[PDB]
Amino acid sequence: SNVSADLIWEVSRNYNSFLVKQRTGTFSRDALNLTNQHSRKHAGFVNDKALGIVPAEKGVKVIAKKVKAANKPASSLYTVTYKSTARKAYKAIASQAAKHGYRADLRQAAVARASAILRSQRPVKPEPPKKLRGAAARR
Amino acid sequence: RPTVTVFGADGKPTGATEVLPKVFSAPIRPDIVKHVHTGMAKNKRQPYAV
Amino acid sequence: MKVRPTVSSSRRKARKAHFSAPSSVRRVIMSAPLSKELREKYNVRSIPIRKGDEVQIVRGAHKDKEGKVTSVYRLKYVIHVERVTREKATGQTVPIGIHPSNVVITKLHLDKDRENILARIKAGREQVAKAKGK
Amino acid sequence: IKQLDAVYESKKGFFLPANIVSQADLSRLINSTEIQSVLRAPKGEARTKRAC
Amino acid sequence: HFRKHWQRRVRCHFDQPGKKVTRRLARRAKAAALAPRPVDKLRPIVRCPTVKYNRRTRLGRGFTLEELKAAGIPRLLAPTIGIAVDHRRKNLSEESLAANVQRLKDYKARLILFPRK
Amino acid sequence: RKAPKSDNVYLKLLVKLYRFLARRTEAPFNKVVLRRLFMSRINRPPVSLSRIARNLKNGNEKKTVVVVATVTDDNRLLQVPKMEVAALRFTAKARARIEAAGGRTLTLDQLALEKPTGANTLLLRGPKN
RNA sequence: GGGCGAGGCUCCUUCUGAGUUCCCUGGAACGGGACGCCACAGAGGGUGAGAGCCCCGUAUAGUUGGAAGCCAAGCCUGUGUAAAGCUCCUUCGACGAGUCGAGUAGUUUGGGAAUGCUGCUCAAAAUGGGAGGUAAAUUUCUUCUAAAGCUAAAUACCGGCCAGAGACCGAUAGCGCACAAGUAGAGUGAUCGAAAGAUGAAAAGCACUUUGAAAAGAGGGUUAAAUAGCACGUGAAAUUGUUGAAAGGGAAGCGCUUGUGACCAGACUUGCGCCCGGCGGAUCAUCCGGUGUUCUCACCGGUGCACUCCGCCGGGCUCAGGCCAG
RNA sequence: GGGACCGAGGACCGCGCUCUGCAAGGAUGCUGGCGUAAUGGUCACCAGCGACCCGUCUUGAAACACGGACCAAGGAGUCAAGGUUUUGCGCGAGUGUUUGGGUGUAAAACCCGCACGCGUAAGGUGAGAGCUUCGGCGCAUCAUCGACC
RNA sequence: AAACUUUCAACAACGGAUCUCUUGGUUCUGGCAUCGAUGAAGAACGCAGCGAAAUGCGAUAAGUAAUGUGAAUUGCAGAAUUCCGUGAAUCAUCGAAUCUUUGAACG
Structure with a gap:
């Protein structure tokens, strides 16, 4: 045919609605981007097979692209919410990415994203009190 | 030739069958697209002059 | 979106017309809404304000306060409501300029002309409602 | 849809263009059996150790 | 080639769509006035003059007197029923005569006349 | 040249494919194809059906003529023979006449599929002058 | 052939949708959040800050009255041996003069067959005159009627009555003029010709007291703000005053590198993993059904019954953690 | 034997050796003080060393000469027509809709009739890129002998 | 040491840059055709309760008549309007008038 992931990357490597560009790096807001980095490896909306992990109320919601439904966005994403154990989410996410050959190159990134989201959901420590120095301290 | 489904006023498929028009x-x-759009977006302007 | 070529979307011309409008156009501009009771009594939404009207101030620093209109000062697009005043340095009270879009009419000064205005507005509204309904 | 097909047939002096490539999936094009079968053995790895 | 003052004699066509709209509105003004009637007059078929263009025909100014007579359309009535008349042109050939009388017969066959008042 | 002057995404895809082929094959065919893809339009003159027909008039029938150019139709030919032509772009009349003669239109990615080393391929260039 | 003529078209006018519902900030919601509504109307503007629904308007169909032009269904009449078109023919058929043209001078044109025009001199014709075609054998042929006149449309437009717009300019810009600008002013005169916008939502433009001759100052007061006082939005630099710190034996300023004094941005505040006990809970493994899926991986619900999971606490240990060094 | 400066890289791969390991393809181990203005940085001044006032113009170069009281704002290779080189794009012996006409949600976008502009209506010898069934085929183009107008 | 010259900072001055705004300009497009002896364009002098300019008007003079709208003007002062009315208004429209001296200017 005329269209492919390669064609889409050709069209969209220089500009996206998801593309945010600053001096220290180029990022992507795409939900199917496991590292929020602009690259063909991580361009989820570009690649035919892609993964995306988003926070849930308690756990992680993992979306994956269905290759037989690219023409149907409302039914194009296999969504599973993993709200059990941290170790069990990692097991399931790493299987969804590496057992049957759907993005084993993104296995590590997916597991890391799940871990980061769970750590974010973990309760947060109070701040240490601020200590003044020198002129401000004596003031 | 591929096929596209037709959707009714309720959002559900009607069962109609349509072929992509090639x-x-x-x-x-x-x-x-860039070249044509650049020209065709200039094609609307009104003149200005001191 | 505008369709008729006679009307213009020019900010410059619109502001010029608003700020150089004569007194009758200023009256039409300083039209004010009616209360709900008057709304279901007359089938009229808004009417130009006049000197004998009783209004309720519902916007501005004066929260929900009522009073009779004292003067419609068409020159600077303000009306004066009775007992809504501020004291100067000397202690003399001066009326506060309030806007008809900020006031709402509670009791309406009635005469033949305003009865005719209400009848015309009601007739148009009911004709269009009947046309839309059937 | 009907009239889209009809109007693109009715355009005069214009036909639907033919692309310079037939398969746009370079992954299939390269990792196809023909290319890899006629292909030469790799001369190195992506990240190569530095000797001296 | 700017030895003269083209700057004071230069013209731009920024009103091309405006004049197109104006001309279209003029054609509708004619058809509002001459509502059941065509907005033009029937013009004859004439062969182009020179050797370069004599292989083609175009529309001429008006029909000749004797070709109107052969078609059976009276002279004083033709401009009234919407046929252009050219008293300067001579047929000089049975070919042109026959082509134009056939055209006038087709006009006759496709015309509708209303009975005066 | 490292990057093509063209902005065509499909020519860029062909450049990537034939770059991989030139790097991973011993084929001077692939190397020359990549070079001719990098060169510009004025250096890729059209090749005519007449030129191809007289380049197959000898014992080179039943072959794949590869031209990295646009193939043009020649009205001076009353008859077109059967022929396996691959090129960047064809004219409508060139496609029609080749397909009526009984040949098949081929693209460069297809030629990479069937003939990744340039076997039984007649590589042709158009008139520069 | 005439005269009335309902009615119609054009243009002005009358009238026609929906939140000021609840909470927060605010001097003031037109801002944020919640819940609704209208939409052939989410153009624009005003209103104490970004308003489709507060107001004017905006979209479409109608509707109220008026103005002048044109068309006009019909209805009254028509008249006179009145006018008109065509046809045929043993009858006729008048067409522009000091104008053409010739010579000459000037001017003009791509155009000495003078391209046109004007002036001077001479000054026409009637199967005539003008312009072309042409070696074709003689000036054959072709095509038109000048010296009298009228005429809408397609065409131009820095001016007139308006109207709508812009990838224009934004107060040293844009017209010279956003202002009592062709003004003040200059020149005998013809003419030349500037500079100059912004308090505040609302003047609410500071009552009263006191010092001062007064101008003003200080209290006090208005305001969200006087760090907005009609020398008024914001308020740079050049230049200046006061205070703070410092340097300075006939230049200062600048580069590299310390030192003193003053003043500061970081980094760290512990993270991870094992051994114990106390717990407290909910998603230990396996199996059963449904669903989803990459067809072998998951998800629920049951099962699990707490030497298995998951979080906390009271302890112990490992590793990794900032700066300067031996 | 004594001293100085440096520690680039970041799983394994290799060359080796004195091979239970190693000084062999780049620094580790142990320990102390402090954990804050302590290191570090910015300003001002002192100190040692260094150091012509910028631009223009002329000349082989200098010197002369010219401009420079300071600050804010403004300020100088633009637009059009006609040629021409290269690059990108579409169609390609054809190409160019926008003179004009037909639609239009109306200066947009979409469509098009007849013209018109520009262009178009045979080899041998030897090389030669690239193919080969390894017997040879032979693009473009070149040198010579050619063939025709 | 102070003073003076110079450097840096804080605040206060001078000046009006920057930002923001704009009843203005500039350019294009569209409908229409209308000055004057029935006295034009222009110039002058008058007219408001309190006005110099701008604006309006002409001894009927910041204006009269008529039509429409429908309750004002506004800086102050004084009158209104009965509001169940031939009727406020620095209102709008506009078909009737008034229209000083000149200026083509005409005893």
Whole structure:
């Protein structure tokens, strides 16, 4: 045919609605981007097979692209919410990415994203009190 | 020839069957689109002069 | 979106017309809404304000306060409501300029002309409601 | 849809263009059996150790 | 080639769509006035003059007197029923005579006349 | 040249494919094809059906003529023979006449599929002058 | 052939949708959040800050009255041996003069067959005159009627009555003029010709007291703000005053590198993993059904019954953690 | 034997050796003080060393000469027509809709009739890129002998 | 040491840059055709309760008549309007008038 992931990357490597560009790096807001980095490896909306992990109320919601439904966005994403154990989410996410050959190159990134989201959901420590120095301290 | 489904007023499929009209298979050329769009967006302007 | 070529979307011309409008156009501009009771009594939404009207101030620093209109000062697009005043340095009270879009009419000064205005507005509204309904 | 097909047939002096490539999936094009079968053995790895 | 003052004699066509709209509105003004009637007059078929263009025909100014007579359309009535008349042109050939009388017969066959008042 | 002057995404895809082929094959065919893809339009003159027909008039029938150019139709030919032509772009009349003669239109990615080393391929260039 | 003529078209006018519902900030919601509504109307503007629904308007169909032009269904009449078109023919058929043209001078044109025009001199014709075609054998042929006149449309437009717009300019810009600008002013005169916008939502433009001759100052007061006082939005630099710190034997300023004094941005505040006990809970493994899926991986619900999971606490240990060094 | 400066890289791969390991393809181990203005940085001044006032113009170069009281704002290779080189794009012996006409949600976008502009209506010898069934085929183009107008 | 010259900072001055705004300009497009002896364009002098300019008007003079709208003007002062009315208004429209001296200017 005329269209492919390669064609889409050709069209969209220089500009996206998801593309945010600053001096220290180029990022992507795409939900199917496991590292929020602009690259063909991580361009989820570009690649035919892609993964995306988003926070849930308690756990992680993992979306994956269905290759037989690219023409149907409302039914194009296999969504599973993993709200059990941290170790069990990692097991399931790493299987969804590496057992049957759907993005084993993104296995590590997916597991890391799940871990980061769970750590974010973990309760947060109070701040240490601020200590003044020198002129401000004596003031 | 591929097929597209027709949707009713309620959002559910009606069962109708339609074939892609052979134009959705045309090449996608962002450079040509850029050139044509640049010209065709200048084609609306009103003159100004001191 | 505008369709008729006679009307213009020019900010410059619109502001010029608003700020150089004569007194009758200023009256039409300083039209004010009616209360709900008057709304279901007359089938009229808004009417130009006049000197004998009783209004309720519902916007501005004066929260929800009522009073009779004292003067419609068409020159600077303000009306004066009775007992809504501020004291100067000397202690003399001066009325506060309030806007008809900020006031709402509670009791309406009635005469033949305003009865005719209400009848015309009601007739148009009911004709269009009947046309839309059937 | 009907009239889209009709109007693109009715355009005069214009036909639907033919692309310069037939398969746009370079992954299939390269990792196809023909290319890999006629292909030469790799001369190195992506990240190569530095000797001296 | 700017030895003269083209700057004071230069013209731009920024009103091309405006004049197109104006001309279209003029054609509708004619058809509002001459509502059941065509907005033009029937013009004859004439062969182009020179050797370069004599292989083609175009529309001429008006029909000749004797070709109107052969078609059976009276002279004083033709401009009234919407046929252009050219008293300067001579047929000089049975070919042109026959082509134009056939055209007038087709006009006759496709015309509708209303009975005066 | 490292990057093509063209903005065509499909020519860029062909450049990537034939770059991989030139790097991973011993084929001077692939190397020359990549070079001719990098060169510009004025250096890729059209090749005519007449030129191809007289380049197959000898014992080179039943072959794949590869031209990295646009193939043009020649009205001076009353008859077109059967022929396996691959090129960047064809004219409508060139496609029609080749397909009526009984040949098949081929693209460069297809030629990479069937003939990734340039076997039984007649590589042709158009008139520069 | 005439005269009335309902009615119609054009243009002005009358009238026609929906939140000021609840909470927060605010001097003031037109801002944020919640819940609704209208939409052939989410153009624009005003209103104490970004308003489709507060107001004017905006979209479409109608509707109220008026103005002048044109068309006009019909209805009254018509008249006179009145006018008109065509046809045929043993009858006729008048067409522009000091104008053409010739010579000459000037001017003009791509145009000495003078391209046109004007002036001077001479000054026409009637199967005539003008312009072309042409070696074709003689000036054959072709095509038109000048010296009298009228005429809408397609065409131009820095001016007139308006109207709508812009990838224009934004107060040293844009017209010279956003202002009592062709003004003040200059020149005998013809003419030349500037500079100059912004308090505040609302003047609410500071009552009263006191010092001062007064101008003003200080209290006090208005305001969200006087760090907005009609020398008024914001308020740079050049230049200046006061205070703070410092340097300075006939230049200062600048580069590299310390030192003193003053003043500061970081980094760290512990993270991870094992051994114990106390717990407290909910998603230990396996199996059963449904669903989803990459067809072998998951998800629920049951099962699990707490030497298995998951979080906390009271302890112990490992590793990794900032700066300067031996 | 004594001293100085440096520690680039970041799983394994290799060359080796004195091979239970190693000084062999780049620094580790142990320990102390402090954990804050302590290191570090910015300003001002002192100190040692260094150091012509910028631009223009002329000349082989200098010197002369010219401009420079300071600050804010403004300020100088633009637009059009006609040629021409290269690059990108579409169609390609053809190409160019926008004179004009037909639609239009109306200066947009979409469509098009007849013209018109520009262009178009045979080899041998030897090389030669690239193919080969390894017997040879032979693009473009070149040198010579050619063939025709 | 102070003073003076110079450097840096804080605040206060001078000046009006920057930002923001704009009843203005500039350019294009569209409908229409209308000055004057029935006295034009222009110039002058008058007219408001309190006005110099701008604006309006002409001894009927910041204006009269008529039509429409429908309750004002506004800086102050004084009158209104009965509001169940031939009727406020620096209102709008506009078909009737008034219209000083000149200026083509005409005893």
